[PDB]
Amino acid sequence: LLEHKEIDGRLKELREQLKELTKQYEKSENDLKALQSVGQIVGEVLKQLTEEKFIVKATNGPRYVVGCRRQLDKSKLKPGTRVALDMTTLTIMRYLPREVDPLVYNMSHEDPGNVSYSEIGGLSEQIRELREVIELPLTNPELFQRVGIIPPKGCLLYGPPGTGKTLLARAVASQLDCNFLKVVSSSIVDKYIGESARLIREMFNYARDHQPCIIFMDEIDAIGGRRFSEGTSADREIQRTLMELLNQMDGFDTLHRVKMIMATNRPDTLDPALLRPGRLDRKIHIDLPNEQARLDILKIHAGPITKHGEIDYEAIVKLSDGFNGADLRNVCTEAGMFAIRADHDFVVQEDFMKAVRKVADSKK
Amino acid sequence: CTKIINADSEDPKYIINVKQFAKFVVDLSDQVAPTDIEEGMRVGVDRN
Amino acid sequence: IKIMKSEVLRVTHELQAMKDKIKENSEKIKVNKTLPYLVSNVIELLDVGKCAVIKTSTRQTYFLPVIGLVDAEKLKPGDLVGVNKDSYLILETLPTEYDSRVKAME
Amino acid sequence: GNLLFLACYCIGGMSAIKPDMKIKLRMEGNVNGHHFVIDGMDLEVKEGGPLPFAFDILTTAFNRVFAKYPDNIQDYFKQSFPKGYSWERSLCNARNDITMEGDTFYNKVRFYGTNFPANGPVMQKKTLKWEPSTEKMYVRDGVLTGDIEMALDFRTTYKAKEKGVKLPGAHFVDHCIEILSHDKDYNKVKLYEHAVAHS
Amino acid sequence: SGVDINTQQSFEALSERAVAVVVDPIQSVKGKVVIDAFRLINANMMVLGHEPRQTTSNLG
Ligand SMILES: Nc1ncnc2c1ncn2[C@@H]1O[C@H](COP(=O)(O)OP(=O)(O)O)[C@@H](O)[C@H]1O
Ligand SMILES: [Zn+2]
Incomplete structure (x- = not known):
């Protein structure tokens, strides 16, 4: 232990502490390759002239005939497949997934927030039916094919506002942990004449590209509101969008592994062609919560709040008839706010009672 | 010339839009002081 | 001790040596990351361990197998960047320009 | 409300080209009071109009050109190429720099001075000529120092970028520099830089 | 180019005979090779009206 105190008094830092610089060695390492890359054109393959010559159009630029790399999947070089081009030799470098619309991207990257099936409240039979009709084709298609049925394309979830259709679909996505397209119909109608149907096409093309994907088209009454020949331009464009949706949904190109959810508050105004099976095989009445459903809503939403002594769901249920979901949650929210009026760190029965009273009064 | 990028004598680059041509983030020539350059004034620049 | 002191000297x-190697790397990285970067809107980021596609202000889309010399997490699809004018990699990130009407209100 | 309007499209063509970047052989100086800059061997003052001093005070600071040497005398000026030679000139001091500013290959001959006498012969613009002056070139400390007497001290130091060229022996090169052609305002000048080596 | 002419002047200062060959590497598609070699013309030579190079054969 003469010069072996811990390790020569130097190696403890000469081995790792200064060797942190080697991590920077790794850093600059990427940089070297990050400087030998030259970037590449991006274009779309227009045609397969022969086994080697590919007619390729660069975006916002000229078009060429270009060969592909020696090792590449020519079978996947279908027309329209976005590809990269070496800027100098102009050869097919690597295919790219189809360009996604910024709107579709934005609608595609909102986090579902891992909402659990516990957090629904009193939807047991309907949630089981929806779980069946959506998820079961995503688990045992062999079951259906041995039965002999074609897996369902999708279903409608109709009910009054605040009945939890959006949250129910979000929970379905979170349980699935698949690609979710939370789309609200009122946000896709545009003054630009051919843009709404184009957006629908982009949505469904994204869905086909990113199986398994879930298309949740909220407020579908704003698109599929029956076809009539009054002739005003706006509703006519709405019919065009509706029929683009109908084609993208049960059109010539058959759909595989893509299931759709359409929620509305006025199911009766939907187009009969959209209402027909093959497109919307199930119509699920997500209706107002019953008394049992109401108390389930209160008990499930009562989780995060801290209860002091006694809180009974039944009295609130009796005093909150006609409530539907979110409003009940409202009762909790301002209750905590009520807790700051007299400066508590908790909630009381009177707190909840006056909270539900205020919620009911605001509902009038 | 566009936003000054908050130079403070260490980041004197500015992004400039050459008309219908592109826009580039560039630095000054030695002959001009930053006090003479500010957002939104027409500036004559070299080509490479 | 003796073999361990030999390891210490090694x-x-x-x-x-690696210090001056790092110095040389920094020298050449400044040699190539010079200054007159060209502005470009990052169209999006793809997976291959990530690649990018950008749209330069010379109305040209451009695929980058490696996203230049910056981080690769924030990189919003619309994040204006300064990309090298010849080898076309994202040399730096620069603050967003505006959102039209958001500039209209001061 | 029921607008549903179409859209037209008006493209804007856009293109440019970087030309052959042009080398501007320009000297700069602030010897007494004026930031004079001159382009140039025809000489033309870019900025710093009619000089408060005579031109000669700066005519001695004028790569790409070298004196003529015989075969006996080693031509450090010549073999230092292609890079060229950088010199420090002491009169007031002068240095030559090569920079890449903008799109111009800058061969600066940056001038600087101090201790300007209030009635010195350099500012009344009086001038007869520069008599032929012999520079004794010799190596002091690995630097090629040329000692020249100014007739109308100079402690020139020449260093090659190629720091491998052998240093020539102490010789005596005769320089004959005279302002060939000029104007009274001294804005359109032609200079002479003839100089031959002598052992 | 102007800068190319400049560097070639620098090289010629080293030795009067000195060539500045250039090669187009992307125009050199299999078969033809696009490459040339130029020296210079002295400005005094051209302004005086004399031709840059004497001719004595058809080789040039
Ligand atoms: N089973 C349920 N029924 C009704 N509302 C619910 C249910 N579960 C949660 N909510 C409440 O509904 C809110 C979300 O709005 P939601 O009712 O899902 O949209 P929609 O108007 O489509 O029904 C949540 O804040 C939540 O408090
Ligand atoms: Zn060149």
Whole structure:
């Protein structure tokens, strides 16, 4: 232990502490390759002239005939497949997934927030039916094919506002942990004449590209509101969008592994062609919560709040008839706010009672 | 010339839009002081 | 001790060489990351361990197998960047320009 | 409300080209009071109009050109190429720099001075000529120092970028520099830089 | 180019005979090779009206 105190008094830092610089060695390492890359054109393959010559159009630029790399999947070089081009030799470098619309991207990257099936409240039979009709084709298609049925394309979830259709679909996505397209119909109608149907096409093309994907088209009454020949331009464009949706949904190109959810508050105004099976095989009445459903809503939403002594769901249920979901949650929210009026760190029965009273009064 | 990028004598680059041509983030020539350059004034620049 | 002191001397000499190696790397990285970057809107980021596609202000889309010399997490699809004018990699990130009407209100 | 309007499209063509970047052989100086800059061997003052001093005070600071040497005398000026030679000139001091500013290959001959006498012969613009002056070139400390007497001290130091060229022996090169053609305002000048080596 | 002419002047200062060959590497598609070699013309030579190079054969 003469010069072996811990390790020569130097190696403890000469081995790792200064060797942190080697991590920077790794850093600059990427940089070297990050400087030998030259970037590449991006274009779309227009045609397969022969086994080697590919007619390729660069975006916002000229078009060429270009060969592909020696090792590449020519079978996947279908027309329209976005590809990269070496800027100098102009050869097919690597295919790219189809360009996604910024709107579709934005609608595609909102986090579902891992909402659990516990957090629904009193939807047991309907949630089981929806779980069946959506998820079961995503688990045992062999079951259906041995039965002999074609897996369902999708279903409608109709009910009054605040009945939890959006949250129910979000929970379905979170349980699935698949690609979710939370789309609200009122946000896709545009003054630009051919843009709404184009957006629908982009949505469904994204869905086909990113199986398994879930298309949740909220407020579908704003698109599929029956076809009539009054002739005003706006509703006519709405019919065009509706029929683009109908084609993208049960059109010539058959759909595989893509299931759709359409929620509305006025199911009766939907187009009969959209209402027909093959497109919307199930119509699920997500209706107002019953008394049992109401108390389930209160008990499930009562989780995060801290209860002091006694809180009974039944009295609130009796005093909150006609409530539907979110409003009940409202009762909790301002209750905590009520807790700051007299400066508590908790909630009381009177707190909840006056909270539900205020919620009911605001509902009038 | 566009936003000054908050130079403070260490980041004197500015992004400039050459008309219908592109826009580039560039630095000054030695002959001009930053006090003479500010957002939104027409500036004559070299080509490479 | 003796073989361990030999290991200590070995590691300190390799550090001594690698310091100037890092200096040379920084020298050449400044040699190539010069200054007149070209602005470009990052169209999006794809997976291959990530690649990018951008749209330069010379109305040209451009695929980058490696996203230049910056981080690769925030990189919003619309994040204006300064990309090298010849080898076309994202040399730096620069603050967003505006959102039209958001500039209209001061 | 029921607008549903179409859209037209008006493209804007856009293109440019970087030309052959042009080398501007320009000297700069602030010897007494004026930031004079001159382009140039025809000489033309870019900025710093009619000089408060005579031109000669700066005519001695004028790569790409070298004196003529015989075969006996080693031509450090010549073999230092292609890079060229950088010199420090002491009169007031002068240095030559090569920079890449903008799109111009800058061969600066940056001038600087101090201790300007209030009635010195350099500012009344009086001038007869520069008599032929012999520079004794010799190596002091690995630097090629040329000692020249100014007739109308100079402690020139020449260093090659190629720091491998052998240093020539102490010789005596005769320089004959005279302002060939000029104007009274001294804005359109032609200079002479003839100089031959002598052992 | 102007800068190319400049560097070639620098090289010629080293030795009067000195060539500045250039090669187009992307125009050199299999078969033809696009490459040339130029020296210079002295400005005094051209302004005086004399031709840059004497001719004595058809080789040039
Ligand atoms: N089973 C349920 N029924 C009704 N509302 C619910 C249910 N579960 C949660 N909510 C409440 O509904 C809110 C979300 O709005 P939601 O009712 O899902 O949209 P929609 O108007 O489509 O029904 C949540 O804040 C939540 O408090
Ligand atoms: Zn060139």
